[PDB]
Amino acid sequence: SRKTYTLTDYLKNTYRLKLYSLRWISDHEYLYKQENNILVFNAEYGNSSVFLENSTFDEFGHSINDYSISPDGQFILLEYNYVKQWRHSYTASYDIYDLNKRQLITEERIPNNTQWVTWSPVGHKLAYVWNNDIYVKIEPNLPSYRITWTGKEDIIYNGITDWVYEEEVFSAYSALWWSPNGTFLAYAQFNDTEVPLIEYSFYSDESLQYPKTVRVPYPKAGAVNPTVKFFVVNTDSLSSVTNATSIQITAPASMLIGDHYLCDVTWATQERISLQWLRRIQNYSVMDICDYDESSGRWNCLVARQHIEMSTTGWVGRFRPSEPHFTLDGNSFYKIISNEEGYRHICYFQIDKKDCTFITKGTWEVIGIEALTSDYLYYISNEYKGMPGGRNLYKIQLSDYTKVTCLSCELNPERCQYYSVSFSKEAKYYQLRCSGPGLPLYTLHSSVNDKGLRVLEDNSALDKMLQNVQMPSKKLDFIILNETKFWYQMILPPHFDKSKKYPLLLDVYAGPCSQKADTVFRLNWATYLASTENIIVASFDGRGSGYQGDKIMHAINRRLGTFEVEDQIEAARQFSKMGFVDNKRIAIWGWSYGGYVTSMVLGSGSGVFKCGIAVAPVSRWEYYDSVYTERYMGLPTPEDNLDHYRNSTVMSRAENFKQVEYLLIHGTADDNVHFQQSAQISKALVDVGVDFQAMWYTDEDHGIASSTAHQHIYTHMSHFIKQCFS
Amino acid sequence: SRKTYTLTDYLKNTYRLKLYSLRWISDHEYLYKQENNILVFNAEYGNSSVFLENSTFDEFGHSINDYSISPDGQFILLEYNYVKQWRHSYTASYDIYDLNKRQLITEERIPNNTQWVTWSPVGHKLAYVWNNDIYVKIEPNLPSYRITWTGKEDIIYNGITDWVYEEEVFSAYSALWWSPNGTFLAYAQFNDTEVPLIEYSFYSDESLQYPKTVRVPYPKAGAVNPTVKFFVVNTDSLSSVTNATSIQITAPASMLIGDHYLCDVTWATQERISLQWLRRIQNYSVMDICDYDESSGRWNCLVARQHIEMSTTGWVGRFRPSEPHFTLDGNSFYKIISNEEGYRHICYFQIDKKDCTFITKGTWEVIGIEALTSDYLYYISNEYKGMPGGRNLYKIQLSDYTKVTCLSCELNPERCQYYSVSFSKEAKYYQLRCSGPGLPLYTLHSSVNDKGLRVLEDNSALDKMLQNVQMPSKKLDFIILNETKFWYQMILPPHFDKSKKYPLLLDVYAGPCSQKADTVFRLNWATYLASTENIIVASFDGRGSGYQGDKIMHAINRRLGTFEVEDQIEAARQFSKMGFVDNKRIAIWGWSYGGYVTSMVLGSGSGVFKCGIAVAPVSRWEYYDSVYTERYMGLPTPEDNLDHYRNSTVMSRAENFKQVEYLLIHGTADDNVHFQQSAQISKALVDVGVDFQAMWYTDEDHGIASSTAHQHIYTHMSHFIKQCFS
């Protein structure tokens, strides 16, 4: 009876998940924006007042993109004229509304085209970056102070990241860090002077007569990297009869010997800052811990508080060296590091001792450290049930490591096997956010005894709409390959039957530290293919996968495009023998790294796959950026790893494409995986006489995410898959 | 039973057309460039001797791309290291070989990366262009004199054209004209200082890490044009210690009041040179006739000797004003101009006499003047049988316009209705090149009494091969659209049967002066479509068509993308009324101007067409170059023709594409019709929710002519057309 989950449902978002996005302002209260207005909720009893009315900015005269209330509660920052840049960066215009005098501030305002804005963490100081320089407002209405004067477009970046650091190291545009009480402002400076430029056409609106050339400083594998410097400025000190002084913190020597990155900054106290540096050979990271010296106004990083973190089987950290969490007095800290067995667990450090003590252990991993009190450390792990694709909140007693309590495992085990958390200021309360296998569910809790205070959002409205429709189901399980287990998921059509022979789509990513087999509830394209088209959508986590230990994660070290593509092939082979797959109708698709894998798979001449789709794929590693590629690949020199760089290209496997149907898709303004990469694929297929299907997206980037390009691409891909199977 | 003409046959060139390319070297002899060696032939008796053996340069140590013999017979120029630039331009290395001494010359060689090289018309003087400057060698082994010192890559060009003059005015890279006895060298200089640059990516070999951005000075419609200068130098008066003096010929008055072009130079005598200038509004041209003055050493162009050639209905010339052919004494000349009836005919001028006397007339046109003796003018025209798509050689007695003899009409009216010609130096002999409707035939004739000396090539080998294969036929005919007759041709499958119903593919160009209905014999993609797939391939010469008078050709003046697109629709409509077309299977395809028209038709909302293919289309006129675009459109200003520039875009019709299957193909390295143009089409189609097929060809240009790309594009188009008609 009734109906399915359609393409148009997915593209028109007819079945929306409800969220409960909150913002902790104190230990006791939080804000809760809506489609209208901003409320302040008391966490204990759940009573609310209106923080400010939805109508307040009717005659503002600009579409407001986001809000930001000063930790003070005294000012609201209004973001508008939002213009997207890279994955994290953008520029916008800013106004400040003064909640005491209920008037907009009109004097000395933050200039348009501003790159980043941040409140100090306690009162209402402001720091913004505009034209690659740093400015500080001590009051919102007063003239700002110039911290920095050397900023130059595409050359010098103060307090913001360049392209590569944005994407690959900080996962943010922001490169500044206030001290806890706002006294100091730490910031990084990047220098792109020597970095070569990727150049591509941007066509813009029809009315643009000549295409423009976008040029961005982008170091491909083995090219010249940006260099970096670090500074701390005192924001109380700033008079303005002269340059307020940035004090550089350099080094350390083991890093200054050659090429290096700044990979983490984390304040420890009002007067102690930590920095992690990482070698270009992403093998070796050093953490420095630096104290403010009242007797000179300098910062001293006592070697002795230096901590060295390294790996002999791979790279350091999941994507980068993990961040420390400091005990209040700042004399000790906790960070997730790799076990002796290769499993990631929490290690406890004294700042001036080199040996840490592991406080958790076992054949599972700590995903993240979430909060720290005097008595407890709260963390997320995939321990429960030994399933690497589930997430739960635990606490551990600082007094005694033997005593660990799961806080989410038991709350609703059939609906909720994947959690994230959001603690109030001193961790007096926390909000749990369950994201599957059932419908997302949000709850409030008080830490004193972990009492569930109330349900915030249960998605009941969505629940009701979904049973007028034949939804698919999700199977999360594993298989065993030469000893080890490897998990997979499958999105099964309604009314599944293990006797019938369904067509199967292998949905792939398979990047280092990837996980495609999890318990998250998703409403996506795969949901349509299963629900309406009766295709099984499968994903497999094989060698190179994450959150299961380095033995599995580091198996592709120096060797991208080997085991992880293999295991995807083997996975399919294993999938068809399961008896409900039509081994004549097996397809495969990937975006990004997944695009690459798909391409490498469809090019292996295994005969297992009939067709496939690669969307913005990498095609050879030398085309991709230094930080990501070299992490896993080393340098493309004959001395280091050049031979494997040359053996792991898509185009070298052009001939085997004669045996499959292939669709190749790429946005023309892709700053990330440049259109170059697909341009070289097509050329090699052409040069060898292989027919294939193609589609460019003009002025689209790696996301292919504008409203119309998103619709068009999934439409086009659906047609291709249906045709390949029907 | 027995084979058809297949796609492989077309792609692998199984059925080859033999040619007979000869190169005259006197009034009496030609060279016959074999794959082996070069023979010299006596045109009277047909006997030959070896000119040089295949193994003469066996150990030159380089592949030889082309040869060129001094009018002397004493020196061969050898072209090697050929590197293509645009449609005509290239660089090469040159060596000179002494024919008498049978020796290479090793001293003072022409440099590598030479842009253009030309012998003088009588002796063995050389003029070459290297790094944008002109040099002259009186003798192959003597140092060059540098004529010019201003050359600058992309800015000043002496003796060679820039992008737009190469493609749109001169149809060559060469911009230098020796006087008849080699005494004077005349040349143009182009300045592109202010010409905006088109930029695009060139990907190159896999091994190139970062794409290069190719940039070329290219004026789009309404942009700053190159400015031009003309100079004459006496090549008998150069001193090797003193700079050569160039004498400028400026103006004229009617041109200098605005932007203008130089569109023709033709020497009249040893001391009289003719120049035609064209205003940027290509309505108005002026011929200057300039005399050397011995006393002053200058050139004087007498207003009184200048001839105006203008148009009230359109532009001047078919593409450009025609070239004059001067009488012996240089005091009169013949050139083709438009009638009072708007028909192109040969007019006889006296140099100081403003009015000319037409020497031909009627409802047909002279295509070109081929040779002028003191006695006769030999021209090609389409008079015979009133067929605009046919070509014959005529001679007209200069003392009596009554006596016009067709030299080709009657030779073989069954096989040969399309002729071109190659005269020996004083027109003592001529080769006739018949190109259809039967197989190409090449014959030699003597002018004295128009005797048919002998058959040179009759393609009998091809003939024997084609009887074992089901070949399509060809109909050439006309329909009537209110009063006027309009010609079409159809490529008809073998065993064509008017009672059956075939799918139709409209093959379109339909540019200003285009001719797609003719009698030429061709073995192409259409041959396969008809022969193997049973598809009728039709082409129609509608409004804007050439060779039928201005009433038809000027119908689209200032109005591109109207009548020519409408008539293409009318044509398909009329082919269905004929009874043998399935009107559920009508398609349209075109390259270049044909791409624009195809695209404009598909987006017309007429519903006649199920599908179509656009290869490298223009999409809006502001994107195309000034010289071609403005000739037909005027300037894109409110004061001139902006509204229609804006009304005739492909992207404003995107909505109407919901009704068609569309295929969009473009080379990424297209210098001519920029990828931009298709980039904007697909963007508009995505914005409106229309699914369609696309294909880019990396590093391919407007020709998409490299061996592998050619095979790939036609394979891809074939599948698409097969899918549409299945």
Ligand SMILES: N[C@H]1CC(C(=O)N2CCn3c(nnc3C(F)(F)F)C2)=CC[C@@H]1c1cc(F)c(F)cc1F
């Ligand atoms: N440029 C890379 C950035 C990146 C990263 O550093 N991430 C994100 C994913 N990520 C991170 N931390 N934690 C988590 C998550 F939890 F999601 F696993 C940081 C991951 C993969 C990105 C990538 C790789 C690739 F091969 C492409 F072709 C394209 C592309 F965007």
